[PDB]
Amino acid sequence: NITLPDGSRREFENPVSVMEVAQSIGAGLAKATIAGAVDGVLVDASDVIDHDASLRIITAKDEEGVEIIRHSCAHLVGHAVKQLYPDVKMVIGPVIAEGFYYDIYSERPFTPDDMAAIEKRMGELIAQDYDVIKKMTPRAEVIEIFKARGEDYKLRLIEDMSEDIQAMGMYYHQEYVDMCRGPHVPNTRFLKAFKLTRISGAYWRGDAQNEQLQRIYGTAWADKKQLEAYIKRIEEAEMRDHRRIGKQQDLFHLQEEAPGLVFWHPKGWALWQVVEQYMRKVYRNSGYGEVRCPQILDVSLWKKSGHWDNYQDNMFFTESEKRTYAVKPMNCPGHIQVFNQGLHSYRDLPIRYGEFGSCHRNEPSGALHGILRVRGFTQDDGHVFCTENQIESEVTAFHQQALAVYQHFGFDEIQIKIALRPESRLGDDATWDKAEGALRSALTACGVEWQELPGEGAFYGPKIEYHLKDAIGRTWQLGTMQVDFMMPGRLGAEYVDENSQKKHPVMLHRAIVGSMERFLGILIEHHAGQFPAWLAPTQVVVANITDAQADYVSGVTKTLAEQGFRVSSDLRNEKIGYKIREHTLQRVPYLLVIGDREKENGAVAVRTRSGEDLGSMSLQAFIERLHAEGA
Ligand SMILES: [Zn+2]
């Protein structure tokens, strides 16, 4: 008495297998049967039902059928490697979201050539259309089987299962055999649309102190259509890994002699310079005097700063002539030293200093990542010294300045937050009243909404946070406007007010883009390595078909460089189409080709990064096109 999803029953005398119920309905359903779900329990198609229960046929159309497909593709990895590399040991071959992997102990690592040979050999094996034969085997026999095959890791997995398990499913793939809970496909004809993807590193028991393993990743789907959809996603996703883009475009690299510290190559530093020189104008137009302050400061200054407990274990320390110093992790006390040089009146405030300050923090090395998490960072840092009456106006100006910068970089989606007084805080409640209300009045005057964050502010004042979404919808905090009414008092900053009363000024720490290393990492992934013209490291490449045009090319290159454009000449003894394909892959916005005709007419043939042929053109008309698009 076997019940089906439609609520009906089919009678069966003598215990019947899942497949046999399928064949009873028809050859067609049988041909489509991958496995069955007896009372919600997934079982192999060859398993018999002896009692009566409710059945549900699982086919390739079910997410459960795709999973079983993925499980059996793992088994095929072992089948192929045991023929190719008979001395390696199979460990585990489980299913994951959208694929599978098999961890394998191999004395030597696996190369891409290994993958290719393995996938090919798998494809050969799947093409035989052989049945997977499940045999429920006693535990002693299973041990005897794997011991004869030299699979020492399978035997350790067997010695893990409790004594409650006295038999286990053995799945035979011709001469290969593997064990698992399953189920698995009844036949390899369901394994058509698979592919191996990456090869990587794993560990026995997932513990880093045991032997390392080769991890063979793969994916599998019901049809090649869905397989290719998955491949496009994987390609489009690697298209936004800044580490991969940094390597492919020769922008930067890190190495163990300086962990978390970036080596900017010429093209990467060109990108940096575009941003820093634009933010330097922001300093200029916002009323900041840019400064530069020492990086190595007496430990005594950091102990007075109010930040000693946060940074005492997060700074590089160094010694000279029996004095102890720290490499600076922040610019603010240096900026207070500048402010302290002169006598200031209330008349003189606000005074604003900006600095692209090279800072270091002794961050844990295991948490470092590309240029997004570093030990050495430069921010578009700045500090405003003002009276507390002026906080609001200063914050409205900064708000307007920050949005224009976000607008300039094509970040249109913003979210603004205010962090409020934390539990462990300093200063009068009345002073936190004035500072918090000043941040609220400022954002109101600018007609913006904001989310409030109870308890999330620094101990020395509230702050406004500027969060931006990038082209794939993920959120980053870029800007900060942090009120500080504590460090100025700690470090002797003061002015004279309306009646000769010496008072400490309020200090505002602020940044618009934050860490430049981080911001460049966000920009690289945001634009998917295809930078706008004003931002590309190499904007124009002037090439030459022949050696005759070489001198004319150099003349063109130096004219554009005098015009302030980032230009590079390609004068190599190389095929010109090869140069075209190579510079196109670098995503260079413009590629001027010079031949006999262009040198004689005084023109330049322009081909854009998209592939639009602009034809021939005067050199002056190309310069005009660049200034129009704000390059
Ligand atoms: Zn600061």
Side-chain angles (χ1 to χ4, degrees), residues 78 106 178 262 317 367 377 386 487 493 495 592 626:
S106 178
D178 213 337
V262 185
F317 294 97
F377 59 93
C386 64
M487 192 189 307
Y495 70 95
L592 307 187
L626 286 179

Side-chain angles (χ1 to χ4, degrees), residues 239-243 245-321 323-342 344-411 413-414 416-433 435-447 449-468 470-497 500 504-533:
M239 195 180 69
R240 300 189 179 258
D241 188 357
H242 79 270
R243 295 174 306 183
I245 289 176
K247 184 186 176 198
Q248 142 205 344
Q249 298 192 7
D250 194 26
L251 308 178
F252 61 84
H253 89 270
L254 296 86
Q255 63 183 81
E256 283 303 309
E257 283 75 5
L261 307 176
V262 185
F263 285 81
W264 294 97
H265 304 184
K267 291 176 57 187
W269 191 244
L271 176 64
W272 180 297
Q273 278 300 301
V274 175
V275 175
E276 178 185 321
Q277 286 304 138
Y278 175 86
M279 302 306 295
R280 168 163 300 113
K281 299 182 196 87
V282 172
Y283 280 149
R284 188 195 74 191
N285 298 325
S286 300
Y288 291 80
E290 185 182 350
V291 304
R292 162 69 71 83
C293 300
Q295 305 178 263
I296 303 180
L297 292 153
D298 193 316
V299 81
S300 72
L301 189 62
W302 302 106
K303 288 180 180 181
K304 299 177 198 177
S305 73
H307 296 254
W308 175 254
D309 294 308
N310 292 329
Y311 286 85
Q312 65 174 314
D313 47 344
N314 195 200
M315 282 183 301
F316 294 88
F317 294 97
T318 191
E319 271 201 56
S320 175
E321 292 176 12
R323 313 242 316 261
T324 303
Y325 302 83
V327 179
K328 74 176 174 198
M330 69 185 67
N331 303 306
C332 348
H335 289 191
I336 291 180
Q337 305 312 295
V338 176
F339 184 84
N340 284 353
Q341 287 300 124
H344 322 278
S345 141
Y346 72 93
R347 282 300 216 180
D348 303 332
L349 302 186
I351 290 182
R352 312 181 195 82
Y353 305 131
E355 174 173 8
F356 302 108
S358 180
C359 294
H360 294 76
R361 288 167 185 177
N362 184 218
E363 303 292 348
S365 58
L368 303 168
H369 187 249
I371 65 189
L372 291 182
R373 294 188 50 94
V374 293
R375 285 184 171 165
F377 59 93
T378 299
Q379 299 196 287
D380 60 322
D381 193 19
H383 297 88
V384 179
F385 298 91
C386 64
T387 73
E388 54 185 18
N389 261 7
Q390 296 163 333
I391 292 177
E392 189 193 325
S393 64
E394 284 297 305
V395 168
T396 73
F398 171 85
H399 174 79
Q400 293 166 1
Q401 290 148 11
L403 294 205
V405 174
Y406 302 142
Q407 181 181 70
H408 189 71
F409 284 96
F411 292 111
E413 301 179 81
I414 187 140
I416 307 177
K417 297 139 90 146
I418 296 186
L420 300 173
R421 60 192 72 180
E423 183 69 14
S424 185
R425 55 177 162 94
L426 287 59
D428 283 316
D429 261 79
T431 301
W432 278 90
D433 273 352
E436 286 175 344
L439 300 177
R440 288 187 187 115
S441 307
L443 289 178
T444 58
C446 309
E449 303 301 314
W450 68 88
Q451 185 197 13
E452 283 193 346
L453 303 167
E456 298 207 25
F459 68 86
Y460 50 87
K463 68 180 163 173
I464 305 185
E465 303 181 346
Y466 286 97
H467 299 251
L468 287 181
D470 61 22
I472 57 168
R474 60 197 180 169
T475 297
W476 307 83
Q477 183 181 340
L478 293 182
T480 304
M481 163 50 81
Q482 167 75 58
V483 183
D484 184 348
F485 38 74
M486 297 304 312
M487 192 189 307
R490 297 290 294 246
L491 295 181
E494 56 179 19
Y495 70 95
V496 297
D497 68 14
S500 159
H504 302 283
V506 186
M507 195 173 68
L508 312 171
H509 321 239
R510 36 65 82 230
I512 296 173
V513 297
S515 160
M516 297 271 298
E517 293 79 3
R518 181 163 161 277
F519 183 57
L520 293 198
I522 299 169
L523 279 182
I524 288 162
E525 312 197 327
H526 176 63
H527 297 292
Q530 176 144 342
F531 298 108

